[PDB]
Amino acid sequence: GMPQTITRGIKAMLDEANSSIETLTTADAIALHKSGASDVVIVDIRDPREIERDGKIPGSFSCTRGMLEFWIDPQSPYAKPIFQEDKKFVFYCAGGLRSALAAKTAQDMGLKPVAHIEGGFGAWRDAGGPIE
Numbered sequence: 001g002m003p004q005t006i007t008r009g010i011k012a013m014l015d016e017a018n019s020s021i022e023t024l025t026t027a028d029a030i031a032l033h034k035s036g037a038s039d040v041v042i043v044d045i046r047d048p049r050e051i052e053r054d055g056k057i058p059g060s061f062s063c064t065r066g067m068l069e070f071w072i073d074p075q076s077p078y079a080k081p082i083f084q085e086d087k088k089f090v091f092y093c094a095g096g097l098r099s100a101l102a103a104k105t106a107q108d109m110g111l112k113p114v115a116h117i118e119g120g121f122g123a124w125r126d127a128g129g130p131i132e
């Protein structure tokens with residue numbers, strides 16, 4: 001049968017996100033973490049099975065990407081108070097792509113300031129960043 005026709009793909013979504021958000025270099029993110037990450041919340045948006053396999057950034061807060069809006073919005077029944085804090089929110093995933101979309105979503109909602117980690121946890125690990 002005729003296949004599905006995708007007319008808006010990840011390329012378009014990622015371009016829109018990337019040009020609107022801070023992409024924090026892996027090295028800068030690692031340095032930020034080592035400084036104590038004052039007034040920063042590092043948000044791990046990976047599936048828990050990814051986290052179990054590969055580990056995580058120490059002290060990061062887990063919120064899967066698919067739940068993000070529901071935990072950010074204070075008017076959501078599922079609101080998490082951490083997202084109301086007067087801090088910079090740095091999102092990360094495995095390779096940097098989901099987290100660009102997540103940062104853009106959060107920014108679109110009004111969360112400010114936001115960023116994501118270039119190359120994700122994969123790049124973090126490759127650089128020898130802190131891992132739990």
Ligand code: NA
Nearest residue numbers: 018019021023
């Ligand atoms: Na950018």
